[PDB]
A paper describes a structure:
The [name] family of cytokines and receptors have central roles in host defence against infection and development of inflammatory diseases. The [name] family of cystine-knot cytokines consists of six members: [name]–F, which exhibit differential binding specificities to five receptors, [name]–E. The most well-studied [name] cytokines, [name] and IL-17F, are produced by T helper 17 (TH17) cells and are elevated in the context of inflammation. IL-17E (also known as IL-25) is a key regulator of type 2 immune responses and driver of inflammatory diseases, such as allergic asthma, and requires both [name] ([name]) and IL-17RB to elicit functional responses. Thus, [name] serves as an organizing hub mediating [name] family signalling at the membrane by acting either as a direct receptor for [name] ligands or as a co-receptor.
Author numbering:
A (entry chain F): 33 to 210, 216 to 234, 247 to 268, 281 to 298
B (entry chain E): 42 to 95, 109 to 129, 132 to 149
C (entry chain G): 22 to 56, 59 to 74, 80 to 95, 119 to 146, 148 to 166, 169 to 193, 195 to 240, 246 to 268, ...
D (entry chain D): 37 to 51, 64 to 154
E (entry chain A): 34 to 52, 61 to 127, 130 to 154
F (entry chain C): 33 to 213, 217 to 271, 277 to 304
G (entry chain B): 42 to 152
Write the structure that this text describes.
């Protein structure tokens, strides 16, 4: 997990003074529970987003959309911690929403968004908004959680994203099988590519002088190695 | 160590190599493992996504961690261990 | 004027000002309170057309009763099953004001109606008793057809039979999802939901029958058009399609989708084939109707017996009722019997060439063997069909003489 | 010992043949460290970059990939203090599984 | 007599947005009802057409009233404005007038 | 739709000054809302309850069990209005809970009760609990609704309520016929309402009403309330005989105890 | 009229038939109607359970849908009150609506 950019992370909307700070999904209100727990947020939904780093890279980003409720618990809302948890491996990253001024006005439906969570391709991230203070022991959960699935590099817009490009989403195999002879393409990496058929052959690492220069092997699938992959990504054939 | 001071300003020692991405193998594995959420609101981590996978000796990859629990007010923190499952790998019987 | 647009307004007397405040307002009389105040005098109505819908137009005569200007308000009530409504009308006569005489009248443009409708009139406050006007709307004026589609936009189904096949074409629009049903005259025949326009194939024998077409909308108006009364070929086919059925030995029934007056008489069929001899006289043309059970006076049946059916003073049906059960036909001759006063009995013979009495010296086939036929009849060998105090009839076997 | 550092709390402490029998064998690595609890962590790094069949030969068709999770360790702070600890998040490579690659072509 | 809203938690002021078929089912229905002029000189609507189901059974196609299947009125609570104190003032009511008459198959218990 | 009694309906529970109030089913919050609003009820359920009276009446009643929410909006909660809305009608009875004490803690789970709503057999309602005050326009629902189905007299428990006793559910008029040139005998009930025998003949299972006959048995005198009465019917195999009581609870719609004729 | 003063202290004149004199014939009727939920937190009543028919006709004794007649919805002119938005001189308003209070089956106007 990672934040997009450590810039001026604001979530404030007019009439409120959000200041965003780091967290670890262990609020002080969980160490020191307070009796008055504000209600859950309403209508949580997550949408994809792509933001531009100053270095010009393309990182998929979770855009979280959730809104409060009209009940009286809004006076006891002091923040809404946002939690992004990877499923298969349990890396958790949380960011603390902190509302300096009390949300004592229901004149307009408050809607909050947060889109600086670099979401990797193909990795789901349960996004939870735990309102602060957190519930007292054996109380109402007051937290919203929803799975946020993200498609692989086969997605049209995702195949141009930096994590997907660095994996070889734009590499053209252009295999040619014709004694038998095969030929395959190259991308500018000092990695040893593979051709598997009942036979096995090895190809050394291409020097920086043959970035896309074709090569061939005499007597059919292709698997590259990379920095974004030591053993597993798109296997061409 | 009955009484030991523990600081809860948790630091992240997982500043790994950012280019090293991750994949979800719950469908591509020889022994695919399904995902189930474990929620105790008196616990960190409150949600642990254990594994319940469907010579097919697909034994659950089971390792135990440390959990900072919560004790009833009559006693309130109780560090324990729960032997949870990570994934599922196939082994020879 | 008779035609007004799809809106409500007022037709106002000249001199006085006039306005409307209709919002289906809360309409209640209250109580009469005492006090030169304007007041209604009579209710005048004219059936007027609103476009397109029929709606009664009402008018309120005005005057001054009681003991630098003049202002008043007239409330117009309404009632009709199941609608209640109220309407505000303000009349302001400039100080054209006189005591004890009429001043003018105001008119409300439109009041939706179907049927009886009643109207009232209150000033606010109610200075005098409310006026009264009942009215019974007609169900047929010359402008009714075109004005309202409910009477003119009857769904259309025109039929063609040029190719001898009854082809019905639907003149309805393309997006219509209407209903179709067929009955008899009521036993329904068939029904179908289908999209128009569409061609439905019928048959000449099928068209006896009636058709109903209607849109598939709530409170559908269904047209049951039966224009085949004038067609004579339809009745001719019905008579041809009509069949005679012999229920038992001494009973028969006439079956047909429709019932028409007719007459039935017995008949005799020779074993030779197509030639057939009617049995009237001495029998009489008995009245017969469809779905009416008639019992023959005969006590015994014979395969050669037949029934002739007269419809509209003309023979149309002739079937061998006993052939379906007592067949095949037998070469048996028929002898007519008659009885009179003084216990006298007379016998006659029926032949294809004519009728001859027995005994006789004629050269006819029956006359030659008349004595043998009489001896067989008196010995009980022959079979008797019907008996009566004044006559009878017998069937005599013939194979003993030729075969 | 609660003080003006509220997040410092006091807690009470409470307290296998697959590696030689799996189609994706792993070799455990000892992360011995006396400063943190536990002092020994066992990390499974894949013996082969591919999987082994019933024969046991490495096949490039089937891939071995390190299934990991983020677990917790308590490291002494200040160092070598038996009555103080620091709650830490580290990543441990728990085991190696067998997965099929995403293969596509013309 | 009242003019404004004061010292009364439930005395409110009302305005004007009160807002030619379906008038032959009184006979065309299988369970006809005769409208009764329940006219009150202080109640809006001034006339309510209560449904008094004219025949206890339902008339089939032949026109002969059949006793195999019965008819029950559909009443409904409505709000009406009866004047009080007897200006323009009103007070609500919950009166159970009858609107229509739907005819139902009887409940049959065998043996 | 009524209350079972007009006695003290106090909802008192430890630490609560609540008093059940009579109300028309419009609130003062509807007329004059306030900005700050409590939350909706939780775990609201309705069960079939029977409650006696001081005169031996047995009424089916609606037991309403709802739990307050844990969130800190309870500090502005001034009560809940109930409702039992009829299905085929639009009749509403709505009683009010004027919580005199100001709830300020959530030390225990509150289970709230109200069991004084009389219901009817073979009838369906809609019960809703709506905390007070009402929300601002275009606000959150602030209430919970449920559908209450009350079973019919065929239920072994409903059959003995005064609803199902006034409608003759317990009635056991075992009607029989005898082959005559027929006679139908049935036993009357404790009511002064006329009885309506309906007789039709079905020659075959082709569903043809070959012959139909109607006879009227008058309102029985007190000496024959529970006696059996036999009436012969003129006949013109399946001669269905149906008997219908005109009990004041069922003007013309009661359980009509039918009969059939065996061919032999 | 335009401005009237309505005291919302509803006087219930449905004080009758406290015993059971009703049933549910939405299903047994030959012109069944499926009830519909009308929800409006700005109006009194906030909930009205109107109806909608199930077919375009009655049902014959065989239990199959019959097209010989027309199932039509009985409708009434119930007065309902509605809460005006703040940009209105009057805070409350009376509106009549047409709601399906039932659904009977009727003879067609023309055969
Ligand atoms: C069945 O009907 C017969 C009709 O004859 C009843 O017999 C007579 O009933 C009347 C009263 O209706 C008595 O006054 C007579 O004494 C009865 N007997 C005779 C011979 O007339 C008979 O009671 C009816 N069955 C039952 C069980 O009441
Ligand atoms: C937010 O900060 C501004 C800074 O000028 C202050 O004026 C305001 O009162 C604060 N609270 C709000 C906007 O709720
Ligand atoms: C939050 O953590 C990130 C990554 O460790 C760091 O770059 C950033 O400065 C931190 N922000 C604060 C307010 O501590
Ligand atoms: C209608 O009003 C007039 C006014 O005098 C009255 O005479 C008449 O009886 C009224 N009609 C009915 C049917 O009440
Ligand atoms: C049917 O259509 C034909 C073709 O236009 C027309 O001649 C005929 O008169 C129509 N039938 C009737 C009954 O009008
Ligand atoms: C009432 O309906 C019957 C049955 O169709 C009909 O004969 C009669 O003419 C109708 N009467 C009126 C006034 O509509
Ligand atoms: C409930 O009422 C009693 C009666 O006076 C009172 O003493 C008590 O304080 C009330 N409950 C609360 C919580 O105030
Ligand atoms: C309370 O309401 C019931 C009906 O809901 C009624 O019978 C009773 O008389 C009322 N009591 C008072 C004091 O208004
Ligand atoms: C009903 O059952 C009772 C039970 O014994 C019997 O005495 C009575 O004759 C029966 N009635 C009939 C068959 O009509
Ligand atoms: C008639 O008898 C039944 C029991 O057989 C009883 O419940 C009922 O109250 C009686 N009727 C009267 C009016 O007492």
């Amino acid at each position: 997990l990672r934040l997009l950019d450590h810039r001026a992370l604001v979530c404030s909307q007019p009439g409120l003074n959000c200041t965003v700070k780091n967290s670890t999904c262990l609020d002080d209100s969980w160490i020191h529970p307070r009796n008055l727990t504000p209600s859950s947020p309403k209508d949580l939904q997550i949408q994809l987003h792509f933001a531009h780093t100053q270095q010009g890279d393309l990182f998929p980003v979770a855009h979280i959309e959730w809104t409060l409720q009209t009940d009286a618990s809004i006076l006891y809302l002091e923040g809404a911690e946002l939690s992004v948890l990877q499923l298969n491996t349990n890396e958790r990253l949380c960011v603390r929403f902190e509302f300096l001024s009390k949300l004592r006005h229901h004149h307009r439906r408050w809607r909050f968004t947060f889109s600086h969570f670099v979401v990797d391709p193909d990795q789901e991230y349960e996004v939870t908004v735990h309102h602060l203070p957190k519930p007292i022991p054996d109380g109402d959960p007051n937290h919203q959680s929803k799975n946020f699935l993200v498609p692989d590099c086969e997605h049209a817009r995702m195949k141009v994203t930096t994590p997907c490009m660095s994996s070889g989403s734009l590499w053209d195999p252009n295999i040619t099988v014709e004694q038998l002879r095969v030929s395959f393409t190259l991308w500018n990496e000092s990695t040893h590519y593979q051709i598997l058929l009942e036979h096995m052959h090895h190809i050394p690492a291409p020097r920086p002088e043959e970035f896309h220069q074709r090569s061939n092997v005499t007597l059919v699938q292709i698997q590259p190695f990379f920095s974004s992959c030591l053993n597993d990504c798109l296997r061409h054939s | 160590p009955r009484t030991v001071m523990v600081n809860l300003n948790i630091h992240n020692r997982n500043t790994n190599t950012n280019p090293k991405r991750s994949s979800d193998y719950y469908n591509r594995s020889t022994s695919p493992w399904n995902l189930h959420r474990n929620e105790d609101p008196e616990r960190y981590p409150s949600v642990i996504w254990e594994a319940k996978c469907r010579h097919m000796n697909s034994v659950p990859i089971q390792q135990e961690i440390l959990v900072l629990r919560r004790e009833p007010p009559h006693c309130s923190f109780r560090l324990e261990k729960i032997l949870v499952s990570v994934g599922c790998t196939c082994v020879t019987p | 004027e008779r035609l007004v647009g799809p809106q409500d307004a007022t037709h106002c007397s000249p001199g006085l000002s006039c306005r409307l405040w209709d919002s289906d307002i809360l309409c209640l009389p209250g109580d009469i309170v005492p006090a030169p105040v304007l007041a209604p005098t009579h209710l005048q109505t004219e059936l007027v057309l609103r476009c397109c819908d029929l709606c009664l137009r009402v008018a309120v005569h005005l005057a001054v009763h009681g003991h630098a200007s003049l202002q008043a308000q007239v409330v117009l009530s309404f009632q009709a099953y199941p609608t209640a409504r109220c309407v505000l009308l303000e009349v302001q006569v400039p100080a054209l004001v006189q005591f004890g005489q009429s001043v003018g009248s105001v008119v409300y443009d439109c009041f939706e109606a179907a049927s009886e409708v009643r109207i009232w009139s209150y000033t606010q406050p109610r200075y005098e008793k409310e006026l009264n006007h009942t009215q019974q709307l007609p169900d047929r004026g010359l402008e009714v057809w075109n004005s309202i589609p409910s009477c003119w936009a009857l769904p259309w189904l025109n039929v063609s039979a040029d190719g001898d096949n009854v082809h019905l074409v639907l003149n309805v629009s393309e997006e219509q999802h209407f209903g179709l049903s067929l009955y008899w005259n009521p036993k329904p025949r068939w029904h179908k939901n289908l999209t128009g326009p569409q061609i439905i194939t019928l048959n000449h024998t099928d068209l006896v029958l009636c058709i109903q077409v209607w849109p598939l909308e709530p409170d559908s108006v269904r047209t049951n058009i039966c224009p085949f009364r004038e067609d004579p070929r339809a009745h001719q086919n019905l008579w041809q399609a009509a069949r005679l059925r012999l229920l038992t030995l001494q009973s028969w029934l006439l079956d047909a989708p429709c019932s028409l007056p007719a007459e039935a008489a017995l008949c005799w069929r020779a074993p030779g084939g197509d030639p057939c001899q009617p049995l009237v006289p001495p029998l009489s043309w008995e009245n017969v109707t469809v779905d009416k059970v008639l019992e023959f006076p005969l006590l015994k049946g014979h395969p050669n017996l037949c029934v002739q059916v007269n419809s509209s003073e003309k023979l149309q049906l002739q079937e061998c009722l006993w052939a379906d059960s007592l067949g095949p036909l037998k070469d048996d001759v028929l002898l007519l019997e008659t009885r009179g006063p003084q216990d006298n009995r007379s016998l006659c013979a029926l032949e294809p060439s004519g009728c001859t009495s027995l005994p006789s010296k004629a050269s006819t086939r029956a006359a030659r063997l008349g004595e043998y036929l009489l001896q067989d009849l008196q010995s009980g060998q022959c079979l008797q069909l019907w008996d009566d105090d004044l006559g009878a009839l017998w069937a005599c076997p013939m194979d003993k003489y030729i075969h």
